[PDB]
Amino acid sequence: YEPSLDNLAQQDVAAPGAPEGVTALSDAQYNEANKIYFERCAGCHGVLRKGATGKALTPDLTRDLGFDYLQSFITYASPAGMPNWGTSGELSAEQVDLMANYLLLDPAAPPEFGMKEMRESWKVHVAPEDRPTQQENDWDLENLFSVTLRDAGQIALIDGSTYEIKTVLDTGYAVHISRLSASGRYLFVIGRDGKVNMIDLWMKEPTTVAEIKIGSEARSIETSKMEGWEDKYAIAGAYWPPQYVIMDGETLEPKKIQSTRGMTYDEQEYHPEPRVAAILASHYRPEFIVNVKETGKILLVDYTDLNNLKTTEISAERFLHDGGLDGSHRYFITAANARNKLVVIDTKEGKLVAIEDTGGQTPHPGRGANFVHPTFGPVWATSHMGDDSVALIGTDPEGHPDNAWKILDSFPALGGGSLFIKTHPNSQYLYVDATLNPEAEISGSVAVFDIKAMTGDGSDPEFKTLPIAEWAGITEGQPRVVQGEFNKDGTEVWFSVWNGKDQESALVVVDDKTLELKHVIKDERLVTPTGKFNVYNTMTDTY
């Protein structure tokens, strides 16, 4: 579950000459190898080949290893996490050789993307002046769902009560997630290619009113959520170049670009490629909360003054990915996934308050799930990609002191490969998917725990299994169920039945009160549906 940097692998490059002891590749061969590198290798080895999950592959190292070593490693791989590209057939014998030779050659230098480039890509389709002054359509905007139709580079706006696909909008490239302005009027989508689209939900026919490119590869975006700063700013984070950008919340005008290149928090060594992961917005101060993966830093960026920029660079833990605020919206709890830790930041005081091991392998909470456990009090939960465990952490320093920032319980759900856990204040249920599980029976189902039945005795809570994929009537292909998302009232929860692009997918709506199938959304346009975001729950951070 590492990033595929496809957009970077669409950029043609100049083939470098070969130095002493190295064979050269033609521009054709080199570009072929370059495409493969960014599409399949850069996620683990880095855009600059400096290393991340995988070891560094820079010439100073690879040339010492030699062609044979590289060829063998790419072909047979290793048990530590390196895929057997050759023996699996993923890469042909010729491609394997291209990659081995490619690794011996000077690394390609992907371009930077500064203000000049951003402003050039900046397009305002409808100036604020010309936009509606009130909602012109009759949609129940707060109950609307924005769904990522992954491979189609589109998003579907679906009605939360009728399940009608109101419209399908194009962005031109695969979108990762949707976020809403604090007023709920503007819908922001971040494309994997670094393209940001801003949609005005007040239009009779909602569409993009402004767009801008902020980098080459990106996965995160957020809006200003401090009271008084509604609709003032939007922020986007990139994998490449390593930077985040604060934009005007009404026009997308790029205001401030900040490089994330810097020192790792622990060994304090310079890191040339620190990717920006999750970005949240503080409700206690006019700040954005930015996760910087490889350096293990969480940045609290004050947007009240972009010229005299105040920031708090918090030393956390390396490999930060996703996370969410607790129920009170004061503490940011995030997964430093590779190290199995949850880092807790007090957004009011701007300081790290705890780092706890979950006892599980690779926690992946999404924004997590907050609920008042019957005996433990307020807790935040996360499931794991590496195993079947669900861990609960106390989130009430003042009210449940001894339980605060301590892993209170850990129990199994359906199986490993989980990606998202979900609940809502109006629900007594905790839903846990198992998207990446190798067993179709598991990956196509969801575990549901009854919060009301949770005692605090150490025994593993029972769960009901919902056959989501089966309910959708989809057996063809590899239909993986992913991410629960509630409607505005918290009475229904949606799940994506993510199938291949040339296969049938669906969205399944579950009645939260009965845990029975409510409705199945199917449409020829529903290609590879993944992330779903309810307007109200996203604008208010209700999870």
User: For ligand DHE, what does the binding mask look like between residues 511 and 530, x meaning CB under 6 A?
Assistant: -------------------x
Min CB(61)–ligand HEC separation in Å: 6
Exactly one of 283, 364, 373, 424 is catalytic; which is it? 364
Q: Which residues bind a second copy (CB under 8 A)?
A: 12-22, 24, 26-27, 30, 58-60, 63, 105-106, 109, 112, 114-116, 241, 243, 254, 256-259, 261-263, 267-270, 305, 307-315, 350-352
Q: State which of residues 4, 251, 328, 361 lies at the interface with ligand DHE (CB under 6 A).
A: 4
Q: Residue 509: which residues within 8 A CB-CB, separation 6 or more?
A: 163, 492, 493, 494, 517, 518, 519, 520, 521
192 annotated ligand-binding residue: yes
Specify the length of the chain in residues: 543
Residue 482 binds to ligand DHE (criterion: CB under 6 A): yes
User: For ligand DHE, what does the binding mask look like between residues 163 and 192, x meaning CB under 6 A?
Assistant: -----------x-xx--------------x
Active site (annotated) includes residue 44: yes
Min CB(388)–ligand DHE separation in Å: 18
Distance of CA 471 to the CA centre of its chain: 27
Task: Choose between 192 and 488: whose C-beta lies nearer to ligand DHE.
Answer: 192
Task: Choose between 300 and 493: whose C-beta lies nearer to a second copy.
Answer: 300
| 196 CB neighbour count, 10 Å cutoff | 28
Active site (annotated) includes residue 45: yes
The entry of ligand HEC, a second copy, ligand DHE, none near residue 352 (CB within 5 to 8 angstroms by kind) is a second copy
Cα–Cα distance measured from residue 251 to residue 124, given in angstroms and rounded to the nearest whole number: 7
Cα–Cα distance measured from residue 221 to residue 241, given in angstroms and rounded to the nearest whole number: 15
Active site (annotated) includes residue 118: no
Residue 148 binds to ligand DHE (criterion: CB under 6 A): yes
Helix (H, G, I), strand (E, B) or coil at 528: coil
Cα–Cα distance measured from residue 430 to residue 44, given in angstroms and rounded to the nearest whole number: 32
318 annotated ligand-binding residue: no
| Sign for the pseudo-dihedral over CA of 121, 123, 128, 133 | negative
Min CB(485)–ligand HEC separation in Å: 27
Exactly one of 45, 384, 400, 424 is catalytic; which is it? 45
The entry of ligand HEC, ligand DHE, a second copy, none near residue 219 (CB within 5 to 8 angstroms by kind) is ligand DHE
Min CB(4)–ligand HEC separation in Å: 9
Task: Choose between 52 and 527: whose C-beta lies nearer to a second copy.
Answer: 52
**Radius of gyration (C-alpha) of the chain in whole angstroms:** 23
Element (H, E) at 392: strand 389-394
Task: Choose between 40 and 45: whose C-beta lies nearer to a second copy.
Answer: 45
Cα–Cα distance measured from residue 493 to residue 471, given in angstroms and rounded to the nearest whole number: 14
Exactly one of 271, 283, 321, 400 is catalytic; which is it? 321
| Sign for the pseudo-dihedral over CA of 367, 262, 233, 4 | negative
Cα–Cα distance measured from residue 128 to residue 210, given in angstroms and rounded to the nearest whole number: 10
69 annotated ligand-binding residue: yes
Cα–Cα distance measured from residue 342 to residue 280, given in angstroms and rounded to the nearest whole number: 16
Amino acid making up residue 194: G
With beta carbons less than 8 A apart as the criterion, state whether 268 and 255 touch. no
29 annotated ligand-binding residue: no
| 515 CB neighbour count, 10 Å cutoff | 15
The entry of a second copy, ligand DHE, ligand HEC, none near residue 196 (CB within 5 to 8 angstroms by kind) is none
Active site (annotated) includes residue 321: yes
Task: Choose between 332 and 471: whose C-beta lies nearer to a second copy.
Answer: 332
Helix (H, G, I), strand (E, B) or coil at 122: coil
> Got the DSSP string for 231-245?
TTEEEEEEEESSEEE
333 in the Ramachandran plot: left (φ > 0), alpha (ψ -120 to 50) or beta?
beta
Q: Annotated binding residues, as ranges?
A: 1, 4, 41, 44-45, 55, 69, 85, 150, 176, 179, 192, 219, 239, 367, 483, 530
Which residue ranges make up the site for ligand DHE (CB under 6 A)? 1, 3-4, 148, 150, 174, 176-177, 192, 219-222, 277-279, 322, 366-367, 419, 482-483, 530-531
Q: Annotated binding residues for heme c, as ranges?
A: 41, 44-45, 55, 69
Q: Active-site residues: which are they?
A: 41, 44-45, 82, 321, 364
